[PDB]
Write a protein that binds this ligand. Structure first.
Ligand SMILES: O=CNC(=O)/C=C\C(=O)O
Ligand SMILES: O=c1ccc(O)c[nH]1
Ligand SMILES: O=c1ccc(O)c[nH]1
Ligand SMILES: O=c1ccc(O)c[nH]1
Ligand SMILES: O=c1ccc(O)c[nH]1
Ligand SMILES: [Fe+2]
Ligand SMILES: [Fe+2]
Ligand SMILES: [Fe+2]
Ligand SMILES: [Fe+2]
Ligand SMILES: [Fe+2]
Lengths: 348, 348, 348, 349, 349
């Protein structure tokens, strides 16, 4: 496990990668459920780098109908919603260390547009240490980004039955290499992957959750297959065993046709993340960035797409990584059978 | 997540429904494992309502042979057993906020018998908020009770194979609608369901735990069927695959034929509880009232029934909700395929 | 300093002297400002003696006009006042361990009349260990009690100028030897002294606070003399230097003529208490029982006397110990120049 | 649940069984993640027995590549590694109460070399109370150890297809009955089982994880079978469904051929431990000693054998209990269909 | 006030001055009443210097007759007395950071004999920060130590009537400049002064506490004079007003003639310490090192001298600094009217 001294040093390293120095101000954003050791490590590491640092503490916001403790489960209002003064307090800093989770929200976007940069850090310290960020991680992720920005379509095939097509072009590419060095940009320690969004109303075909594939935030390995039929960018059919019924029931409950929209799509580039890690954690440990980021996955998602100006506000949100896939950009394979093949500069 | 401010206002709403005001005295009962945020919110809310308040702290009572941390799993003595002073400290109050989980005990019943009312509150704050009690919930549960109090039999059928008969009349009905407003009433925030007990040595037939059904306190969705054969009020056969072998081994561990007796039987009326919720929580989060209360389930139980004057004091205790059941009071259905149909007033 | 393990053992010893065993119930009374180490040691010691134990926690009560943090300085309402349910909660126990201080109030007396016995314990752990009670302290105090109950006058002379007469007989004797063994009786760990009250409207003469004598709760050694003139049981004159002006100003603040009434009078029998100890403590450490109890002092008091049925409810309260005094009961000296001389079996 | 007073009373009873009195010194070893109630209970109990007590606190050690929170996951370096002054601090004690877990590390065997005994105590208080150690547990475990010490081979069969042979002799027998009474010896509260290691490069055959069998630290009940093929002391093949693919992926992650070596083998003698208990716990509660100790299991293990002077220091370490087994010492059965049958004096009432 | 981050940075500075690096081991010694921010800062600073760090925690030791909370009140018995294993755990370290205070105990000198160095650090963080140790401080204190080493007698005089003579030679000179760099040596952060002990049974004359002079641990500025008459190394008379009566009462309470023995004597060399500081603190804040260290004071002491192998075990211990003195070594002044005049290189800038 990670001692307090090492946790502070880890934040020193990541904050320097994020260009924190004498001239920079740092706001550490927290609520009552924020890990106090990570808050303190971020405060002290910032002071050691001679930055001007303060904590902003917000009362927790609660969604009555949200279930479970995973913060990615209900994407709606946040503790910043309605509180313009607290938003101004964060916008006054060069960098925000977010230990309470704001991603996917319009207030985060307004803060980024002021040139403030944001580093989400909410996973447990030992996970933080296993995927401590590197410049080489950034360089590999950025090589993939060069390819993705030029692509006009993404395709996924798997021997389990995936056969999924998504025209591209309308939306930008987003990268996560684990530190917030550029102004006006968000990132998440830990990470190491990239994605974009399909053209409006255009994604089509079949995505098959094989035995062993994962739904977040359920955090289960599927023991029976789930087949998703997708037409015009929306899930229109969910078929299979018990997991299919559970998933159908869960999506039903939000009583909103927007929950079935396909949102972001991409592939993983983090070899220090592990498909097996989720089985070694309890559900309340965190959001399981291992499942999102592991090398050579195909990651897709459902629900809201307003963070790039899509139509859907809906709060129901799922992240679903697939193993053993082929991922093509136009006619070029970037992943073959779950292994990263292109571009060469992105492989580990 | 729920803020301290929100948690205190929630208790103000529930204590007010429970008729706490300046004429009343409130004891907040706790032990070392009680959630200090909930304790504090209850102390604070009671004072805001202008009641006189005090906390009573009991040493934790340990059952050597109980396994796991769920308090509903082993019903033996409690911290109140042989502690008449502590019991009178609770009887001095008009209402007890129970944050330590006094099992249904003879001492609990003698406290209720003096007119003191008891409100159980132990589920996590976010769960308390999702199922915040309402007067409408009480109306709908009372309408159902009216029909249950007159039934001479209850019957349960399912496509999966349940075919279960329970003569009634010997034992009363009991409701749980989330607050303790009448003298001598015990209730549980969150809840929203009702139940009774079969006449002695009388229940007959078959109860099938289908794929997706739940055993508490195991807190798993069954992946293979379990068939329970019942004769003269007792499980006599437990048949199936791994889950059944697990169940057989658990019940034999107590080395007591009383564990196989069917205890309470009833159905759920809480549309804000969710069959899917259990899979979003870890086991030590709480007892999963979502599983017990969700709208239209059939809930039956095994083990002790001394709380209604039955013969069985055994500690081993299971709560088992079933989906997709038809439930009949005499020859009228109250639930059809997991949906509440009667009384109309009880529906959501 | 005192470790946690030693503090529990000390409570074991004093609770045994207090006749706590498996037949006894113990209530540990606390509020937010109670020393948590002493609370826990009391709870754990009572559980080790196999008693039935619980804690009762009351919201703190605030006297708006009270100055400073000494709980003996404003004797009025307590947190028990108007909380009859919490009073019953305490009356249900055989012994109350008071860690929040109730002395001088009617609720404590009604608790004692039920047969409940009360042990105050609020001094620091190190002070509690320096004056750990013994049976031999009890025996010495009771020997002095036998003499005091027969006396019908008390007289004090000092070379510094005291010349004070108090007729006795109207009011009983009170002892404090450090543990609560007899039913319906209060005591204070630590102590070891005894007192009575003068006949109403009868105490007369002069009491001189010499250089080095003490006023509680001020907790100063006088550096200039204060002369108190007493006529018909009341101070009618306060003369001297800065300490006299300070004392005059402080008593006048309560705007109540009852503050000048002489209340309890007696002498100290604790040789493990020290007149020098006060100068080694900060004011918020405790109430300085060393100054009240030290061997051979004369201790008098002002203010309320309704704890024995006198006329005065007033909250202003002072405890003043004098050194080097001669103390006579009728014509026989029990203290000569600050040394205990009679009875012999009370000397140490 | 267990109150502070009872937890202190439990440590008094266990430390007394561990021969702690006024002549003994006790070191309570801890790090930041140690359960503070258990730390405090041991300190206080040792003081009430009038032993000379002190705590030793080490900064936590993190292995970058380790995953999840189970103490047995990464068995490599520890917070003691390279800290020889801290090691000597522990060696000064007669008994160390270990609340951070040094087992499977070289420094532990060196501390035991000096005559210090060590009691591991890391499971939740309620689990500690369910399996509060007893002298009769020690008597039954030692009767089993007699036979194990006399054996030249161990064999396992099961109806699911286990057919496994291990020559014995090279390595000693290790017992765990829950308290550390003898000098220079380690034990674990709770326990109640015994094991040894096979001769180097010699274990052979097949071990089948049947439905319901368990892999630690995964802490799952197998829902489909896994077949382990063993040759010359090493797993050479892992076959089955998803559980097998998960296991293969986990073991290859460490990129070290030594993770496939068979380590300790033995059987369970603790009837107060329960095969069903794991299902009532979350993963972070503890290491699940119920699964290791329950009466009549066959327990084998993979990876490191350095603690008895073996070849392998690898970090990846798995504990796998099997139900329903027949377990033989040479030609004589000690367990049949998961029930302890011999010696008679080892059986529970 | 001092933030957590700054407090860790101070311990980095002081531990480096104390020669802590990757080759060294550091034991942080504490009890329940140790300041936990200081404990944490020391542990963390030692780790960031890549020292091998551990904490050693002892159960607090209470002397029944001890009064008040000052750590110097009842000297002699410590939480270490009779705990040989804990003492060894401390001797395994190169440097002990002492946050519970062992000075004036026999165990401390034994630990130092093994080569372990000890740094006491118990004052509040703000006091630590105001007198953060420096190399120039060490330079000035050693300049003064050179003179004290060659002296055959110390004499004190003051207009208030001090006239005190102490033959020297039998005991060594002890220095305190704020950090523990040399092995086998103890120091105190904060400090900056030096002292020795008079030859056995030889101190003679009078010491007068003037108005404004201080008794520790009473922590009061004298408002009336106290006259101490001294013969053959022992106070034989204590005369004056209320302060004198309080002092006589306190010293006789211990019922032990050894409390009147004169112990260490010396002068203050720390200009960042302040005679006025004590009046801005409460009695439980700390031991008031300002009053012991301030520049030009004369500091003498009563009671124990066992820590340099003397006859006296007694627990009652008093620190008394005097202002406005002339202090002589043989016939040469080192302080005149409370200002430091020699050696020149020991004076403040
Ligand atoms: O009593 C009905 N059920 C509940 O509300 C929950 C737990 C329990 O006491 O059994
Ligand atoms: O890194 C992340 C984390 C959460 C999320 O929803 C997307 N990307
Ligand atoms: O022990 C005591 C304490 C306070 C007091 O006023 C009298 N006696
Ligand atoms: O008690 C234990 C615990 C872990 C292990 O590997 C063996 N024995
Ligand atoms: O630093 C100190 C403190 C106390 C003392 O007696 C000597 N030196
Ligand atoms: Fe997503
Ligand atoms: Fe039930
Ligand atoms: Fe009084
Ligand atoms: Fe193993
Ligand atoms: Fe001294």
């Amino acid at each position: 496990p990670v001692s307090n001294a090492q946790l502070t040093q880890m934040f020193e390293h990541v904050l320097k990668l994020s260009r924190v120095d004498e001239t920079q101000s740092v706001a550490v954003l927290k609520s009552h459920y924020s890990d106090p050791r990570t808050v303190n490590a971020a405060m002290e590491a910032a002071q050691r780098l001679k930055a001007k640092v303060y904590a902003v503490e917000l009362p927790a916001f609660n969604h009555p109908t949200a279930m479970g403790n995973d913060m990615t489960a209900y994407c709606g209002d946040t503790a910043l919603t309605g509180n313009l003064a607290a938003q101004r307090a964060l916008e006054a800093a060069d960098l925000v260390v977010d230990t309470m989770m704001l991603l996917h929200s319009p207030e985060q976007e307004q803060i980024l547009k002021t040139g403030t940069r944001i580093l989400l850090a909410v996973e447990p310290p030992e996970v933080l240490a296993r995927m401590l960020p590197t410049e080489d991680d950034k360089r590999r992720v950025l090589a993939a980004e060069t390819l993705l920005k030029q692509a006009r379509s993404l395709h996924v095939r798997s021997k389990a039955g995936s056969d999924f097509h998504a025209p591209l072009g309308q939306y930008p590419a987003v990268t996560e290499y684990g530190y917030a060095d550029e102004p006006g940009r968000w990132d998440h320690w830990p990470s190491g992957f990239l994605f974009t969004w399909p053209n409006e109303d255009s994604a089509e075909g079949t995505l098959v959750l094989d035995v062993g594939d994962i739904i977040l935030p359920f955090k289960n390995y599927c023991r029976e297959r789930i087949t998703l039929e997708i037409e015009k960018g929306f899930i229109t059919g969910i078929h299979g065993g018990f997991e299919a019924e559970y998933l159908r029931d869960y999506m039903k409950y939000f009583n909103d046709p927007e929950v079935y929209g396909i949102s972001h799509i991409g592939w993983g580039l983090q070899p220090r993340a592990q498909w097996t890690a989720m089985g070694l954690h309890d559900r309340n440990d965190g959001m399981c960035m291992d499942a999102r980021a592991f090398y050579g996955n195909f990651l897709f998602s459902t629900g809201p797409n307003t963070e790039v100006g899509g139509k859907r506000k809906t709060p129901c949100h799922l992240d679903i990584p697939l193993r053993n896939c082929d991922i093509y950009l136009d006619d070029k394979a970037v992943v073959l059978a779950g292994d990263v093949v292109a571009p060469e500069e992105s492989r580990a």
